[PDB]
Coordinates of C-alpha atoms and ligand atoms in Angstrom, one line a residue:
Chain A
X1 CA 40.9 18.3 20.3
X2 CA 43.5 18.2 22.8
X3 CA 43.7 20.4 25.7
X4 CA 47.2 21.4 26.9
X5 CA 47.7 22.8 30.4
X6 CA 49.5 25.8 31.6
X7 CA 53.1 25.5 31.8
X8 CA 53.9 27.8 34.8
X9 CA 51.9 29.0 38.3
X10 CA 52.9 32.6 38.3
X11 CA 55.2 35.3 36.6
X12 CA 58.4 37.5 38.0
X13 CA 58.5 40.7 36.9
X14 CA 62.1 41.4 37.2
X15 CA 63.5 44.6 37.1
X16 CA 67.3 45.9 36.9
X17 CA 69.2 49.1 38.5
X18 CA 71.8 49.8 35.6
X19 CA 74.3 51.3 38.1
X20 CA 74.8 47.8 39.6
X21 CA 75.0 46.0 35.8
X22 CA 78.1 48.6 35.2
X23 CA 80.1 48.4 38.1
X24 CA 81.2 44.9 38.3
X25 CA 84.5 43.2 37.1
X26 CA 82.7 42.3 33.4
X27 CA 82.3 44.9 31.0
X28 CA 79.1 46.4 30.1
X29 CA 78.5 49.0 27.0
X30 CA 75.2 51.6 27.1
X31 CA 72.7 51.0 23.9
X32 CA 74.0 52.4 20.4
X33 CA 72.1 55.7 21.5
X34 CA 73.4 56.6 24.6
X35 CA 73.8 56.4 28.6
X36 CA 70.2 55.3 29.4
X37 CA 68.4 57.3 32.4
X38 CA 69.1 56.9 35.7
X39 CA 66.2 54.6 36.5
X40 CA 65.5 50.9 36.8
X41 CA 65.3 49.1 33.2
X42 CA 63.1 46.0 32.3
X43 CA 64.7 42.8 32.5
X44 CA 62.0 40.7 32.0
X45 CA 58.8 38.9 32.9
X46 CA 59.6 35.4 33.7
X47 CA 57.0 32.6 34.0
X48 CA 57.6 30.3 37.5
X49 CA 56.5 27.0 39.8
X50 CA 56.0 27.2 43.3
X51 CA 58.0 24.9 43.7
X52 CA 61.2 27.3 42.4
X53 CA 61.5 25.8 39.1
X54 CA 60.8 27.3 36.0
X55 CA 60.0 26.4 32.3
X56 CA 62.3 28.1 29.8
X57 CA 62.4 28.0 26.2
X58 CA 59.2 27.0 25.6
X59 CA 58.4 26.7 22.0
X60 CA 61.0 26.8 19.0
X61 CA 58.5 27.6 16.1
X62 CA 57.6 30.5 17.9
X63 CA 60.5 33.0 17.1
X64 CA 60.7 36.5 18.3
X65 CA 59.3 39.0 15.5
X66 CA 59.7 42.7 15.9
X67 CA 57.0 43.4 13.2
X68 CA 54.4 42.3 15.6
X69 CA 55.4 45.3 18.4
X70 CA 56.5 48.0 16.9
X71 CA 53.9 50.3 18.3
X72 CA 55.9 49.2 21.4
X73 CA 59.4 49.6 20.1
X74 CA 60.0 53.8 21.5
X75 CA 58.9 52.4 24.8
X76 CA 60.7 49.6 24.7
X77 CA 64.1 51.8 23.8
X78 CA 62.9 53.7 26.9
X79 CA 62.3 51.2 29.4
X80 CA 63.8 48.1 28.6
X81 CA 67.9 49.4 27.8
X82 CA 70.4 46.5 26.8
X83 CA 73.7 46.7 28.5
X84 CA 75.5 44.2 27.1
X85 CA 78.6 44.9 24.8
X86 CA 79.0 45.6 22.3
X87 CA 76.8 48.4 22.4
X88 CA 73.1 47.2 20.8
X89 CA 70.0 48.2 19.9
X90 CA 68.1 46.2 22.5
X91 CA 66.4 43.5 19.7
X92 CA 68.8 40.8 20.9
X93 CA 67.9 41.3 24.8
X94 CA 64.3 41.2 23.7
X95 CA 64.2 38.8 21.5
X96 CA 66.0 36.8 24.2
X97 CA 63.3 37.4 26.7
X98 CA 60.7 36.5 24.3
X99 CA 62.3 33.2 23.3
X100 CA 63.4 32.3 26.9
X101 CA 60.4 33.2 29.2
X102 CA 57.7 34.8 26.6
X103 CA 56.8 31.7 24.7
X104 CA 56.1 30.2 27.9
X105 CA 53.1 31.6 28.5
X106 CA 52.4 31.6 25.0
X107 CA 48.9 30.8 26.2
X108 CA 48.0 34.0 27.7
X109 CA 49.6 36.5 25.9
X110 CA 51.2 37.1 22.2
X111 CA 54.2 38.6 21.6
X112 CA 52.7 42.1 21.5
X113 CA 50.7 41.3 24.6
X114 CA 53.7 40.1 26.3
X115 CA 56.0 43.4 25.7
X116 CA 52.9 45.4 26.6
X117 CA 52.1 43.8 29.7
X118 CA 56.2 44.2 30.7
X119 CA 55.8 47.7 29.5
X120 CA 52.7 48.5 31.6
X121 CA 53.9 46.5 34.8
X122 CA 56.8 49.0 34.5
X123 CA 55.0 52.0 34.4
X124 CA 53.0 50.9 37.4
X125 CA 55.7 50.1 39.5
X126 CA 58.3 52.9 39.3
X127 CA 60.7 51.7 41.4
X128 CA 63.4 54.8 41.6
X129 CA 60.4 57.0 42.7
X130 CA 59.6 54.6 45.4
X131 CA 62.7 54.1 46.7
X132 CA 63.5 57.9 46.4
X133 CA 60.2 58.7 48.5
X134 CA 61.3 56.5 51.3
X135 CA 65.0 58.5 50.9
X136 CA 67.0 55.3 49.6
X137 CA 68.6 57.0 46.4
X138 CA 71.0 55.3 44.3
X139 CA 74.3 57.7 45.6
X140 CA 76.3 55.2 46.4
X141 CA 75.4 55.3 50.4
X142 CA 74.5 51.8 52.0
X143 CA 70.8 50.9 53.0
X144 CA 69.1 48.2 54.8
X145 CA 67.9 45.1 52.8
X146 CA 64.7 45.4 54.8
X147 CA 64.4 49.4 54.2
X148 CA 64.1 48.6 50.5
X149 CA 61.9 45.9 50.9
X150 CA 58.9 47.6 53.1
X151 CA 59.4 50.7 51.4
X152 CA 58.5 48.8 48.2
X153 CA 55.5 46.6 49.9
X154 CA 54.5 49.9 51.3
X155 CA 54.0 52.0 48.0
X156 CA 52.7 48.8 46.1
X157 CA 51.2 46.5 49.0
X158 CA 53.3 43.0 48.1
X159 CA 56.0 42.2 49.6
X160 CA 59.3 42.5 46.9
X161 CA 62.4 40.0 45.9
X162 CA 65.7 41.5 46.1
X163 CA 68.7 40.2 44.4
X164 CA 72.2 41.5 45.2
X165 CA 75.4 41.1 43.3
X166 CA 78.9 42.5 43.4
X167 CA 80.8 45.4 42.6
X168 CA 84.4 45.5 41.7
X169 CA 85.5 47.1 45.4
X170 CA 83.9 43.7 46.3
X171 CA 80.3 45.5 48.0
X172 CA 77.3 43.8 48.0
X173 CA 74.9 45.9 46.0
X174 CA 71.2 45.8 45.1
X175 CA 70.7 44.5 41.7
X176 CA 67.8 43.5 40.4
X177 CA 64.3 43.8 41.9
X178 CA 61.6 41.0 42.0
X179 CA 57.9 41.6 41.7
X180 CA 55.0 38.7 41.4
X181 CA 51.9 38.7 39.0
X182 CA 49.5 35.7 39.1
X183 CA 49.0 33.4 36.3
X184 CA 46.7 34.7 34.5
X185 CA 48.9 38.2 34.3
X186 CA 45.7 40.3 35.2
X187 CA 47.2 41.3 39.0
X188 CA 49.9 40.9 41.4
X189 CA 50.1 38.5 44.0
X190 CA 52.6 37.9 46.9
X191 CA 55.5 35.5 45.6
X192 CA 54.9 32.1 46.6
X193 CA 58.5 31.3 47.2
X194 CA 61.6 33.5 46.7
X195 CA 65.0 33.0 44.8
X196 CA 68.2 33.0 46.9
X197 CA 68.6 37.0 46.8
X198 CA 72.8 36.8 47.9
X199 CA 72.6 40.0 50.0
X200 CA 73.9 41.5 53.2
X201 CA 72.1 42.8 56.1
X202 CA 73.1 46.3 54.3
X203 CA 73.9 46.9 50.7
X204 CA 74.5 49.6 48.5
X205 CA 72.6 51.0 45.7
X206 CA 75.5 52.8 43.9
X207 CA 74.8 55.4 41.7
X208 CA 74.9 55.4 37.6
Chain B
X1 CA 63.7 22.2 6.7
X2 CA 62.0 19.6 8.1
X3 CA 59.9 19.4 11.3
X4 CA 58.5 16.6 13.3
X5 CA 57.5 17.9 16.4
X6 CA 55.3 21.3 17.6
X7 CA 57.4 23.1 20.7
X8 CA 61.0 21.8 20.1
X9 CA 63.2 21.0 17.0
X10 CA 65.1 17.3 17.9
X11 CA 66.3 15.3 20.6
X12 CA 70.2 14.5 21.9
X13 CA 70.0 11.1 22.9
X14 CA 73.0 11.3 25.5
X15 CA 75.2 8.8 27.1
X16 CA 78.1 8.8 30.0
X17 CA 81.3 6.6 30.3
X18 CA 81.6 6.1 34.2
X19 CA 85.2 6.0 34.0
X20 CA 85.4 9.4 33.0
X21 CA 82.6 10.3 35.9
X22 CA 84.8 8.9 38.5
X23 CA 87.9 10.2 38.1
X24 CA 87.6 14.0 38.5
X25 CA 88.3 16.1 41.4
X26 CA 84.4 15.4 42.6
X27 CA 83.3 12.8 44.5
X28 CA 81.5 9.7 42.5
X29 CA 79.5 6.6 44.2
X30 CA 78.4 3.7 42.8
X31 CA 74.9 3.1 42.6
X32 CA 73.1 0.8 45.5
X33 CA 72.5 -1.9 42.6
X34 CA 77.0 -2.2 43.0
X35 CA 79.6 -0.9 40.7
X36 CA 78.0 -0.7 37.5
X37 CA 79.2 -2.3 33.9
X38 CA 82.2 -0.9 32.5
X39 CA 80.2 0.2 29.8
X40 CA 78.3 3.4 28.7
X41 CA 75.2 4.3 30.7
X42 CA 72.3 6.6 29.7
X43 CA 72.3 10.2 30.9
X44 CA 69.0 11.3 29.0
X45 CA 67.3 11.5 25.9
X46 CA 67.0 15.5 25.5
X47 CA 64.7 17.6 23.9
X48 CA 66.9 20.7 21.9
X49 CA 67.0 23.2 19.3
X50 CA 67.8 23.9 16.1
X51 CA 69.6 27.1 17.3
X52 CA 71.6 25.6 20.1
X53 CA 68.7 26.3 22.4
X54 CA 66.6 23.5 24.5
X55 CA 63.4 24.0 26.6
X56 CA 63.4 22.2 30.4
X57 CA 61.0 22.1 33.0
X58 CA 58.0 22.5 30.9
X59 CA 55.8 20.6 33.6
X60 CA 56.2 21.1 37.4
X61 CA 52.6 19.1 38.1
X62 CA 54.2 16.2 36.0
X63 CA 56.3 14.3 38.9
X64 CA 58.4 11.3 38.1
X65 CA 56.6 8.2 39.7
X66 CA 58.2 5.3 40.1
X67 CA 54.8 3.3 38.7
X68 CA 54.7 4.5 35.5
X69 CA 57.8 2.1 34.3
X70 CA 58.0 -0.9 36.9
X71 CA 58.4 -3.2 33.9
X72 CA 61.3 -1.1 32.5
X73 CA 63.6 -0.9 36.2
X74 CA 65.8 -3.7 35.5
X75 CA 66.6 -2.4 32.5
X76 CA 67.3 1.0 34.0
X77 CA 69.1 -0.5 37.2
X78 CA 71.5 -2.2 34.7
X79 CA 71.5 0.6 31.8
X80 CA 70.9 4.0 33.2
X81 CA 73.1 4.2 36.3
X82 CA 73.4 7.0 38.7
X83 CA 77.2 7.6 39.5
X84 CA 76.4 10.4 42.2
X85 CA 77.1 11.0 46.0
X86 CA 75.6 9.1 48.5
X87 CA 75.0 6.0 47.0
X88 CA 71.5 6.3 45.5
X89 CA 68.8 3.2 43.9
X90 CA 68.9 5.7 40.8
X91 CA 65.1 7.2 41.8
X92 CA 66.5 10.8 42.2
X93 CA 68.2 10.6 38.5
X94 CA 65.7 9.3 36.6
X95 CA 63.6 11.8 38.4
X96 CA 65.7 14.8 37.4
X97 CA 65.8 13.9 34.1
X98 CA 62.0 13.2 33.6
X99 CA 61.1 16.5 35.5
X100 CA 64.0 18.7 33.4
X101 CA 63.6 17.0 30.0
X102 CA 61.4 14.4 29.2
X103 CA 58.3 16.7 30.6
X104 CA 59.3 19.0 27.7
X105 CA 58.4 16.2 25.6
X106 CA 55.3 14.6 27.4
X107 CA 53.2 15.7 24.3
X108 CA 55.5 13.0 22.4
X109 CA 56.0 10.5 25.2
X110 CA 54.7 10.3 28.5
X111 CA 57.1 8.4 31.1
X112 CA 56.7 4.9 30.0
X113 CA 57.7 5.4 26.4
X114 CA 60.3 8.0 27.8
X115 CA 62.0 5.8 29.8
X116 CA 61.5 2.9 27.0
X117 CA 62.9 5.1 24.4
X118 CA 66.0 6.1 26.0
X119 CA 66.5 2.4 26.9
X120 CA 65.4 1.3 23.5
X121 CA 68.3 4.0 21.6
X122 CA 71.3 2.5 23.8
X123 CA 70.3 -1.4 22.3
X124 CA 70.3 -0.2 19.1
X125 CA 73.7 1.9 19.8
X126 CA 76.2 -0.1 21.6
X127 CA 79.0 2.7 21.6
X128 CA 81.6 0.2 23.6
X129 CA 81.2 -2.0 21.2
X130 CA 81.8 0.2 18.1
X131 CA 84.3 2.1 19.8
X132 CA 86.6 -1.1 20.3
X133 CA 86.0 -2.8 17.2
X134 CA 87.7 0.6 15.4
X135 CA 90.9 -0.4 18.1
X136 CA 89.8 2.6 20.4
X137 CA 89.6 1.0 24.4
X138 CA 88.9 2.4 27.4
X139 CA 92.6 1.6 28.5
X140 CA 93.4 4.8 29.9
X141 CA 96.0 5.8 26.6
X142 CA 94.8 8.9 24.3
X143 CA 92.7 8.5 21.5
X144 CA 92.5 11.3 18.6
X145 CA 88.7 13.0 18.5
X146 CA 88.3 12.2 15.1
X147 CA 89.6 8.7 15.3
X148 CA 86.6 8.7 18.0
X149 CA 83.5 10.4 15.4
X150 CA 84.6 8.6 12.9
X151 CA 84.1 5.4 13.8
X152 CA 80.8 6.4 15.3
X153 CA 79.3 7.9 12.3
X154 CA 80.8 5.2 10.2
X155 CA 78.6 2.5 12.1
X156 CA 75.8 4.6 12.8
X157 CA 75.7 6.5 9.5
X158 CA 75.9 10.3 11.4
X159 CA 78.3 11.9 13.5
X160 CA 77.9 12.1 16.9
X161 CA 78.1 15.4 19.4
X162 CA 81.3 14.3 21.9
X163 CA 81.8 16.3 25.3
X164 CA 85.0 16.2 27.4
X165 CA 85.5 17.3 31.1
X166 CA 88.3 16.7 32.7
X167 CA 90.0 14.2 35.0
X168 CA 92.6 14.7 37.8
X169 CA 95.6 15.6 35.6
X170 CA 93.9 18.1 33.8
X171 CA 93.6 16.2 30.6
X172 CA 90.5 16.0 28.7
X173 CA 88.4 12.9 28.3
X174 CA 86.1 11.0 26.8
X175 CA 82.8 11.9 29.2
X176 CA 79.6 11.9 26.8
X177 CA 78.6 11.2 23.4
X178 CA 75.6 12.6 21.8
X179 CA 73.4 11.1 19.1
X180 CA 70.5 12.9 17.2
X181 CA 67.3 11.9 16.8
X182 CA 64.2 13.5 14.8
X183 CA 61.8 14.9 16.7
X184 CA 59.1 12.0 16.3
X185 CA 62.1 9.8 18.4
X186 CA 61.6 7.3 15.7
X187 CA 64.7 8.1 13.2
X188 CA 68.7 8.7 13.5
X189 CA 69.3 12.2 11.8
X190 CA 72.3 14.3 11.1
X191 CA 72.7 16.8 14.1
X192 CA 71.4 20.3 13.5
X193 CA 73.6 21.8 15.8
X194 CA 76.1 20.1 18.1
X195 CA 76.9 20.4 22.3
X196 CA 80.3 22.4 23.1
X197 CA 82.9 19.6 23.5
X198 CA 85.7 21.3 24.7
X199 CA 87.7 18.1 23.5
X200 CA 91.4 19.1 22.8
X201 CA 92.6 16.6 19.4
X202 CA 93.6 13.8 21.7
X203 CA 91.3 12.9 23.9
X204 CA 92.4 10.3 27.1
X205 CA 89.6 7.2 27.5
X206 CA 89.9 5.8 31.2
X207 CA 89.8 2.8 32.8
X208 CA 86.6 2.1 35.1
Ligands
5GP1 N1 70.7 41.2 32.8 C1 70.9 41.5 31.5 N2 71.0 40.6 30.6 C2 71.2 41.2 29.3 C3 71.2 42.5 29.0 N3 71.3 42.7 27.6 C4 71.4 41.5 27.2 N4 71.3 40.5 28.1 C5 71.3 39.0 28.0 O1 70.0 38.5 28.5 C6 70.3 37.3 29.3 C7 69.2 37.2 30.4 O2 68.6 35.9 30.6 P1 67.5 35.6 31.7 O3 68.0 36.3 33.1 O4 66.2 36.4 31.2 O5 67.2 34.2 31.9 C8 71.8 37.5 29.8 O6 72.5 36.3 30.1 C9 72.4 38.2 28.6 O7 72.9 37.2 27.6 C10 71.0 43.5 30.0 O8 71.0 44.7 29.9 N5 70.9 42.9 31.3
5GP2 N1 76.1 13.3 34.6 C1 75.5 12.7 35.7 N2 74.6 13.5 36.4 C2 74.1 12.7 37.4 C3 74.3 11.4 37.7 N3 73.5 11.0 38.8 C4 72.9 12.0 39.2 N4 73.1 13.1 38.4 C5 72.5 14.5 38.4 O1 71.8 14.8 37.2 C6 72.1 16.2 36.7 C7 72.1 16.1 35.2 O2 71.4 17.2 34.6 P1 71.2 17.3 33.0 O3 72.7 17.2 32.5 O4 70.3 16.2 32.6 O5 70.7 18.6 32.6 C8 73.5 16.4 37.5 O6 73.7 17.8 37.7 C9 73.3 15.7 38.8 O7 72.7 16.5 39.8 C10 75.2 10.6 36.9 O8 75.5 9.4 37.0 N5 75.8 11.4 35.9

């Protein structure tokens, strides 16, 4: 038979601050069941080179299929919010994910294995209660990019990604949050190489 | 529907007029090999989805070497350009499109009979050639889109994807034209789904 080899090194598990999604010059529109908590929402868990490139839509006859997590769906309503417009249920953001970045490592886990894995990577790394303990909360105030960053490697011991994008008064805020697990998705490891994270020497995490 | 390969649905077999490369607001160089034919030259043969989707870099440890089609570089000096800045021998664009799309495909053809497939499409597809014989030349005057798929899909039994960008003036041109081919790479079919051509009706075919 023919072996195939692993498409991707490691995996980014990214996470997003909702107050930074909503604030910008594009429109955004809270899930069909309301303004989702004041916390950091799943984005996604994205297979990666070390060289910086990724694979992406890995396999076409692969499609994403609800039935097969929804023991995961309440958590998934939870923790992984949709904030595109118009307002949605979240089943076109996952789906998306799945298609995009899940079938990619198709290899080590299913589709249920997949969500779960997102699902339990977010419980482990709360990311507002970190922040919060180091007294960086998201109120608007400004906040070194390297505050954010040690306060994180602190509290988890690996050294975080930060992206940064910008509000409508033109600020550089802190978006999304990067977080490395090797390849075989059992533990995390330090990134091998970082994506260009556009941010200032301060930023500010504004409040949602 | 029918399927004839396991992680993706077809492949866009994809080809540039230079004239239409050159003339825009960004910069353009001939190739090291000299100004190339005033014909079309090969962009890539890419691997894409029924649902408008298309995997890429599916194999980082999969580098583009130079050695795997030796016997097929005249052929690609003379038929597969590269039209960007500085002047390049072509290496760094047949590179990018091996390590983007034709890895998403090694499972189907490894470099060799990537290259020599892509080479092996534009013999059997002279697109000049058709395109002139139905009174359509690359004279610089306006053309009608139709006028343009029509005679295409009358020679070639299926009608092609077109894609316009747009030169100097604004207008829109005649820049690529996409042809569909089953996922085995060894027969024409009618496109699934076709590129975004943001072509307006008449559609301007420069002089190169
Ligand atoms: N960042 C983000 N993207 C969302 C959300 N809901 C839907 N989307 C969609 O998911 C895509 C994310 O692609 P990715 O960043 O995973 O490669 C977006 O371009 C958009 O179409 C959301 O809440 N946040
Ligand atoms: N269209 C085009 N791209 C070229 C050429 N030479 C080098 N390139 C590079 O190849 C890339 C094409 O990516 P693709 O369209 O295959 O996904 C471009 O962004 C550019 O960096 C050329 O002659 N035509």
């Amino acid at each position: 038979y023919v072996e195939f080899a692993q498409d991707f090194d490691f995996f980014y598990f990214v996470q997003q601050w909702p107050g930074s999604y909503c604030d910008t010059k594009q429109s955004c529109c809270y899930p069909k069941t309301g303004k989702p908590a004041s916390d950091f929402g799943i984005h996604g868990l994205w297979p990666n080179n070390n060289d910086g490139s990724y694979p992406s839509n890995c396999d076409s006859n692969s499609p994403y299929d609800q039935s097969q997590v929804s023991d995961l769906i309440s958590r998934m309503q939870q923790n992984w919010p949709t904030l595109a417009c118009p307002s949605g249920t979240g089943s076109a953001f996952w789906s998306h994910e799945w298609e995009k970045h899940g079938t990619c490592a198709e290899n080590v886990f299913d589709q249920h294995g997949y969500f779960k894995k997102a699902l339990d990577l977010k419980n482990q790394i709360n990311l507002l209660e970190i922040l919060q303990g180091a007294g960086i909360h998201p109120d608007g105030g400004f906040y070194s990019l390297n505050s954010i960053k040690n306060a994180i490697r602190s509290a988890i011991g690996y050294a975080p990604g930060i992206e940064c994008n910008v509000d409508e008064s033109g600020n550089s805020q802190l978006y999304q949050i990067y977080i490395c697990v090797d390849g075989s998705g059992s533990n995390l490891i330090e990134c091998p190489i970082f994506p260009r994270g556009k941010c200032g020497s301060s930023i500010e995490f504004p409040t949602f």
